[PDB]
């Protein structure tokens, strides 16, 4: 029952500038024009729907962007990749370019139980007028593609990155119903098959 949650002061610096906001969920930047979220988020949103880059409430954001394509992982795991139209619908401080207004996360090489982790995202975004929050805790179990962690989350954290102490991404917070009665939370743990699927969807050039 770890509850160590802080309001993010400045979302314009990494890792905070790698996190994106849906109307009611979270995602994060993994590469050029590319974000990760979960399948619950990808069921709710469609091509042409919009994300906001790293909003800090009404203090501003890195722009508003259109979802260009959605690619759900073909395995059972709760993970989706979305590609983003590079030209913003509404500009960020660094201009209209998605990539200049965000910084992508790198994959962690691995993780182990008891590692210190951080979840960054948008809990209760209506109630907390889209402020970004960091929630800190530890890994409780890693089994195949299942990551159980002890860090406080709320509705809206669905799709949040789970980060190691060096701000590399280890997994993505579940959007599905959690284990009943459990004070711990779940995430898809990034294994080689999942990393490969993601990497194959990252963009590299302009058309
Ligand atoms: Zn939903
Ligand atoms: Zn470009
Ligand atoms: Zn273009
Ligand atoms: Zn091409």
CATH of residue 18's domain is 2.40.10.10
Active-site choice (21, 42, 54, 78): 78
115 contact partners, CB below 8 Å, separation of at least 6: 138, 139, 164, 165
- Closest ligand relative to 177 C-alpha: 1
Indicate if 78 belongs to the active site: yes
Query: What is the rounded distance in angstroms from the CA atom of residue 28 to the CA atom of residue 37?
Result: 7
Among 35, 38, 36, 27, CA closest to 177: 38
Catalytic residue among 40, 44, 71, 72: 40
Distance 45 CA to ligand 3 centre (A): 22
Which of 105, 132, 163 terminates a domain? The answer is 105
Method: X-ray
110 and 206 share one domain: yes
40 is catalytic: yes
Same domain? For 90 and 67 the reply is: yes
Are 29 and 55 part of one and the same domain? yes
Give the SS3 label for residue 1. coil
Q: Which two tokens stand for residue 37?
A: 């979220």
Query: CA distances (Å), 53 to each of 45, 118, 201, in order?
Result: 16, 19, 19
Joined tokens for residue 33: 């024009």
Q: How far is the CA of 85 from the centre of ligand 3 (A)?
A: 7
For residues 125 and 99, state if they share a domain.
Answer: no
Taking the C-alpha atoms of residue 67 and residue 83, their distance in angstroms, rounded to an integer, is: 6
Residue ranges making up the domain that contains 70: 12-105
CA of 68 to the centre of ligand 1 (A): 20
Are 4 and 66 in the same domain?
A: no
C-beta neighbour count of 89 within 10 angstroms: 13
Q: Are residues 40 and 114 in the same domain?
A: no
Size of the chain, expressed as the number of residues it contains: 207
Give the Cα separation of 110 and 185 in Å (integer): 19
- State whether residue 139 is helix, strand or coil: strand
């Amino acid at each position: 029952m770890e509850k160590n949650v802080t309001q993010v002061k400045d979302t314009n610096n990494f890792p905070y500038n790698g996190v994106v906001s849906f109307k009611d969920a979270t995602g994060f930047v993994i590469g050029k024009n590319t974000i990760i979220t979960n399948k619950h988020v990808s069921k709710d949103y469609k091509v042409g729907d919009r994300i906001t880059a790293h909003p800090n409430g009404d203090k501003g954001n890195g722009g508003i962007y259109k979802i260009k394509s959605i690619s759900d992982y073909p395995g059972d795991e709760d993970i989706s990749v979305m590609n983003i139209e590079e030209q913003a619908v509404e500009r960020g401080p660094k201009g209209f370019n998605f990539n200049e207004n965000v910084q992508a996360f790198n994959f962690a090489k691995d993780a182990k139980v008891d590692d210190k982790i951080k979840v960054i995202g948008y809990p209760l975004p209506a109630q907390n007028s889209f402020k970004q929050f960091e929630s800190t805790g530890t890994i409780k179990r890693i089994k195949d593609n299942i990551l159980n962690f002890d860090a406080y989350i709320e509705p809206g954290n669905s799709g949040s990155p789970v980060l190691n102490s060096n701000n590399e991404v280890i997994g993505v917070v579940y959007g599905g119903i959690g284990k009943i009665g459990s004070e711990y939370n779940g995430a898809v743990y990034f294994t080689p098959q999942i990393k490969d699927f993601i990497q194959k969807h990252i963009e590299q050039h302009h058309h």
